[PDB]
Amino acid sequence: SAMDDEYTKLLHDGIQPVAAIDSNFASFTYTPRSLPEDDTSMAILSMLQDMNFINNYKIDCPTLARFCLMVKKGYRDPPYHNWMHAFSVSHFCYLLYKNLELTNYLEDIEIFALFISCMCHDLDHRGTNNSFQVASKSVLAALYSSEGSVMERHHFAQAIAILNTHGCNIFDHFSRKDYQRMLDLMRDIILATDLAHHLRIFKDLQKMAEVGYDRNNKQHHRLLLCLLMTSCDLSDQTKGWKTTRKIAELIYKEFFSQGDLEKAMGNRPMEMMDREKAYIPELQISFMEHIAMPIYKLLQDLFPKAAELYERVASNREHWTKVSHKFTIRGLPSNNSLDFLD
Numbered sequence: 181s182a183m184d185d186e187y188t189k190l191l192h193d194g195i196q197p198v199a200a201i202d203s204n205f206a207s208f209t210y211t212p213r214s215l216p217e218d219d220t221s222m223a224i225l226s227m228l229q230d231m232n233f234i235n236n237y238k239i240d241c242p243t244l245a246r247f248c249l250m251v252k253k254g255y256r257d258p259p260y261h262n263w264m265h266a267f268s269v270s271h272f273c274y275l276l277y278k279n280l281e282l283t284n285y286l287e288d289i290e291i292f293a294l295f296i297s298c299m300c301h302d303l304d305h306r307g308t309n310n311s312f313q314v315a316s317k318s319v320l321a322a323l324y325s326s327e328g329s330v331m332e333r334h335h336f337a338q339a340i341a342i343l344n345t346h347g348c349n350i351f352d353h354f355s356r357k358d359y360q361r362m363l364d365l366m367r368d369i370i371l372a373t374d375l376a377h378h379l380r381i382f383k384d385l386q387k388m389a390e391v392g393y394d395r396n397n398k399q400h401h402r403l404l405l406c407l408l409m410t411s412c413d414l415s416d417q418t419k420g421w422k423t424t425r426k427i428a429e430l431i432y433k434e435f436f437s438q439g440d441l442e443k444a445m446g447n448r449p450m451e452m453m454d455r456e457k458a459y460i461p462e463l464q465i466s467f468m469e470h471i472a473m474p475i476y477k478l479l480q481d482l483f484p485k486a487a488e489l490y491e492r493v494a495s496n497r498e499h500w501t502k503v504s505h506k507f508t509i510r511g512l513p514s515n516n517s518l519d520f521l522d
């Protein structure tokens with residue numbers, strides 16, 4: 181059994197120091213997709229140890245090894261929504277902790293919940309969005325369509341199922357109230373990964389950033405948790421252009437596969453999921469300007485040590501406009517043929 185021997189080494193060999201993963205591992209310029217996937221469950225353990233969550237919460241090391249592997253194996257392999265997405269979303273969360281002094285804004289448990297939520301937040305993604313679940317009358321829609329945030333409810337429920345698999349409940353020693361609190365946090369944080377929820381609360385995040393964050397305001401804690409989670413989720417866009425170019429290819433590969441399925445069901449896909457209508461520079465610039473850039477500008481307004489992130493997102497947004505001409509075929513295709521016109 182494969183998870184068996186991976187669990188054995190991950191448990192008995194010990195936790196590698198975070199600096200022995202990469203000497204810039206804790207830096208905003210690091211690209212965690214560079215880490216071989218075979219190294220990521222150990223990196224997860226290193227970060228959890230480096231943030232002192234293992235010690236502070238007395239996590240059982242056998243239980244935690246089993247947890248991290250179950251979570252890794254709970255992801256499928258679509259182009260974007262796979263375990264390396266969840267790993268790099270988790271890594272950004274760690275970066276926020278190492279760079280933004282989160283302990284002056286959030287309780288220890290909420291910071292713990294964010295990280296765990298990041299590992300869990302796309303569990304069992306099938307490469308399709310919420311509209312498709314309803315359109316295709318999928319089992320998930322039959323469970324959750326009346327509540328909304330179908331996939332994100334499924335992600336949460338998958339995280340609970342992992343917690344309810346014997347030997348995997350890293351929380352099962354918590355006080356009854358702390359346990360309820362952590363699962364409640366995880367619900368709130370995963371559900372915030374629905375961009376429809378982010379977009380619903382944007383004015384409140386705006387309003388919170390303008391008056392200033394009130395450490396004593398419980399609703400500010402929730403709002404801030406949702407913004408940090410979204411910032412982890414879109415964090416691919418805060419790295420160099422090449423990362424974002426590769427990530428754009430993964431996303432559009434995923435969307436266009438969904439759009440192909442929708443056409444094979446008689447539905448006109450969204451322009452962004454239809455490979456015969458999607459103009460990728462247009463869409464990316466729209467996504468960066470209307471969604472990506474405002475999230476990091478809000479992150480910057482709350483944490484000034486986060487300016488570099490927003491400036492990265494803005495740089496990448498402007499590189500899309502620069503390379504947009506390259507989607508126009510000049511001269512002949514490199515094979516010298518115009519057969520593609522027929």
Ligand SMILES: Cc1cc([C@@H]2CN(C(=O)c3ccc(F)c(Cl)c3)CC(F)(F)C2)n2ncnc2n1
Pocket residue numbers: 375413414415416417427428431452463464466467471
């Ligand atoms: C890090 C990152 C993440 C996402 C997406 C954004 N998402 C959307 O629904 C979406 C909404 C409006 C858009 F204009 C587009 Cl293009 C997509 C949800 C998702 F697919 F899960 C991840 N993108 N998309 C393009 N570059 C991205 N970079």
Ligand SMILES: [Mg+2]
Pocket residue numbers: 301302332373374
């Ligand atoms: Mg998601």
Ligand SMILES: [Zn+2]
Pocket residue numbers: 265269301302373413
């Ligand atoms: Zn995600």
